[PDB]
Subunit: 289 residues, 4 copies
């Protein structure tokens, strides 16, 4: 089992480059640093190579998140949008492979934001999402990449809110490299039981995100870490566990993740590192790895 | 400590009137039935008197919730909107008094929906809200009504997300009849601790809402009910405990509360009643009353 | 899944008879009343016939526990004690049959008290225990009786303290009518996880005892009842769930069960009955049945 | 808040000397090493000055526990035993001061084991214990020593089983240097709530022991550590937090602590040290200080 952290923990804007974080995160002891795919599509093939070398030199693995947009996604009713989404995924996946990244996760079946002031078509988005994912799976598979479908809370997605729903979706896709992805923040809202949701995912659990209910680093709160740890071991999970803390107000991240109040305790960079380092140790000790 | 339920548990549309529920809820054993104030604003004085007498004959108390709109609220930057909001509250409060109601709760300091696709002025909304609420407190007090400010999760409000922030808001208002209101659904997301949040509200807790993390009735899930009951007793809470379950998809309620999947187990009305009845007994036994 | 209560809940002395409790417990709503098998050995045939008739007329089932003494335990290294133990069991099993009882539980593999100020031979007691139980299994089986081996905390037994140890023992016994029996009071001390223990027991769980960590009735405390119910349902448990609360100090029960302070809140009989009734409803709603 | 460990974690016999552990434990990062006070009575003043220096040199503090015996304790009905207890305590306290020890804890009001096969006198033992402790308090105070009365579970003590009982006893003693001492292993059995017990102790909490329900090091199990940490901070606890794990079978320790099965995972010394080092980091992060 490997542990990582989403580098945006230290930023206020999604536009901040992850390059310098490779070395920093490795120095803090993490096995993995999770990055945002969109950033990757803007680097030159020479820059990607430099980034891949930095990761190799620092002995750290890269994992990536992908957030489709309203104009480029696989679930839209608009065929043009679906075609652009498929084109967007193929391009991103090719670039992702250039960084030796083999795990891609996120709401791949949908997009963000999602105007909930406008009527929603659950059955339709589900059916189109299944088809769209099925259609890019082989391309990802040729690159040795697993696509991990993230189950989200009701406020962020209306199709997959439960591990059981996530598993049904994945079975419908019917591809060996499409997996379910769970996140403690989202499970905290929707699931009946953390252990049960993890066991339900079982062999299909391909990626895992952690954070307290209000998104502080693991160990600062009341999440049932021991129960979670036991469930992950019950299913012999040997994948990645990425902490995705968001404790800073301001900027695009602050408003997008809706971090209205500071939850860092006015931490300077050194305190932010310390919390990350302690959460890492806590996670390895209580969860495994 | 008295127990009640929000009548919309049995409906799919907010427009469904509450009149017929007075007796139904009383017979299920509840001490209280919580209703929507906007319906009270539509009933005629004769109809309100009928409702009032019905509550009396059935030995049940009524409590109400107010949901200000972006056009009539107390926190708007727009002076005209703030004035419209004040008039709305005074009119509403006068009508609420006709039904012998003494507790009004909700996001009285702001409104709903609230478009988060646009910039937000947290500090200004907070300050205008404090002055706005201070400005209607005596009018409410003259009618013997307590105004309970509901603390909400980040996806629904950006001003008060924590019991501590709620307490600070209430102290800033400085009115004896203005109280803090907490809700297990919202606390489940934002609070470091349920017991600590309740103890923090302390003497200022004037209303309380319950439900599991995904909103089914109390006792169906993993919520720390024992810890909650203990804290409520710790602060000698003798107010109302209203379960606010939302387990049915469809209609304006289903989309507004984002109930994307059924959480009632396909229950018919008779089963809905049974869940409420069992949750009531469970609440009385674990929490108090 | 059926619910019952150990009748000594209302007494101070083990010597108190259960006969009068058959009807009392049935009217409180329980499916089962657990009794001490040694009391059965003291009634005449006519009395046993009356009791059996009483249980059927009141629509309630009897289940019973066995508590071997140091003079008649199957684990003794003294061959004569083992022989006495075997005779004790045969006589007790034959008497239990006269009451149409099909479930017998307890530390059948050992005895009580047990002087831990004297040397312990765990390996030996285990081996003789397996032998002895295997040795009476068929006699019990011919009477339609299941023997359920209770896993206890370290202060009461030194051989079987965990569900896993209980399972290994039952497997060594190798008899279809010999099962594992778990108790929340004991699991709370020894187990890593309530859910995993129940799951480890799986198909072999033949009897179940409940109570809070300090032995109050279910629902009065912090036990993870939601987790326990989910686990019991996971293994499709349809056996009995017996609440075994001990909240009264004084008398032999108080000193034997070590109830050194009153845990009933100074309850009169009406309150004791009410608590039992509330715990029963709580258990059915949260655990099942 | 300072963190320590009881050195017997690494042994099988109570007679093993703690000398070599002062430096071992300090190098592991602990602020404190707790030892058994009776051992201190065996050293010459010279050996004691050497131990005191080793502690100062290694920058570690010493804390000690006392377990009175059946023949020398403060609660016995027999006046000769009470005189023996007082004399033994005064002698030990004088010796303890030579190692600059300022905290002495344990079942100071009683003794161990306590034969429960014999009748017990709660009210009498309580009264005599209060008198006995009150009687040596000034002597300990003149040496700068706080006497911390440990609340134990029902199987080990019959006088003080809950924080509230401990508080009543300490208030009856009426001495500033006599405090309540809580242990998570004991609280796990007897307390209605971990957080409520700690708050109840409040300003009177003078020492604290940690371990999982089955005595593994902190962080290995289901104990509500986040809730405990919150409570310790609510009362501004600035005392010591000593982990008291017993995971090894065999020897006098194994039988006295009733460690009937290995809970160390067959750990060699390095693995035992690692578990301790990891529990220490877990405790500083989750409990505080």
């Amino acid at each position: 089992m490997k542990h990582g952290i989403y580098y945006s923990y230290w930023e206020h804007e999604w536009s901040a480059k992850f390059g310098p974080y490779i070395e920093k995160v490795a120095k803090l002891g993490f096995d993995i640093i999770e990055v945002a795919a969109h950033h990757i599509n803007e680097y030159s093939d020479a820059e990607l190579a430099t980034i891949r070398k930095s990761a190799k030199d620092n002995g750290i693995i890269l994992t990536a998140g992908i957030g489709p947009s309203k104009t480029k996604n696989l679930s839209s009713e608009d065929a043009a949008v679906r075609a652009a989404g498929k084109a967007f995924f193929e391009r991103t996946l090719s670039n992702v492979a250039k960084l030796d990244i083999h795990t891609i996760g996120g709401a791949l079946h949908s997009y963000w934001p999602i105007d909930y002031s406008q009527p929603v078509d659950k059955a339709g988005d589900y059916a189109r999402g299944v088809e769209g994912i099925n259609g890019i799976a082989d391309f990802a598979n040729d690159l040795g990449i697993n696509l991990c479908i993230e189950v989200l809370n009701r406020f962020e997605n209306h199709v997959l809110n439960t591990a059981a729903e996530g598993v049904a979706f994945v079975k419908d896709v019917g591809k060996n490299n499409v997996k379910v992805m769970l996140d403690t923040f989202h499970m905290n809202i929707e699931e009946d039981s953390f252990g049960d949701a993890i066991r339900t995912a079982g062999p299909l659990l391909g990626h895992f995100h952690t954070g307290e209910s209000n998104r502080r680093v693991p160990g600062k709160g009341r999440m049932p870490w021991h129960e979670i740890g036991l469930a992950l071991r019950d299913i012999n999970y040997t994948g990645a566990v990425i902490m995705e803390p968001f404790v800073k107000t301001g900027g695009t991240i602050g408003s997008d993740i809706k971090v209205w109040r500071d939850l860092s305790g006015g931490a300077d960079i050194a305190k932010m590192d310390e919390d990350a380092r302690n959460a890492l140790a806590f996670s390895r000790f209580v969860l495994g790895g």
